């Protein structure tokens, strides 16, 4: 896997951000976690979902550099998503969410599957320290 990099257009939830990737707007979905979101009724604004939100917004708003990095499956969802891990300044922000319990690791389809082991060891921690989600 490679990075590549792509400039901020808007957050729009915690788990997903809108980039210009080459040239073009795009929606992208992070790979491998699910947050609590502010969007879709049913739930509503599901507890934490502002939070994780804020988190993802200033982390890549307050970058000087944001590189995606596409898995080896497929690159799309069924709704025209970019399916990526995406990185502020070096950092996984995937990662930081479920770091900070912030996220669960998702439903796990190879092989985009690739950072599954890493971030269930962070979740696992988060758990340990039983952090937001996890408290």
Known sequence: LHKEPATLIKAIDGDTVKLMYKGQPMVF???????????????????????????????????KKIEVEFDKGQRTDKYGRGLAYIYADGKMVNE?????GLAKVAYVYKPNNTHEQHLRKSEAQAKKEKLNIWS
């Open 29 to 63: 979905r992070l790979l491998l976690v699910d947050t609590p979101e502010t969007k879709h009724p049913k739930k509503g604004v599901e507890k934490y979902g502002p939070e994780a939100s804020a988190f993802t917004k200033k982390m890549v708003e307050n970058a």
């Open 96 to 100: 930081a969410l479920v770091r900070q």
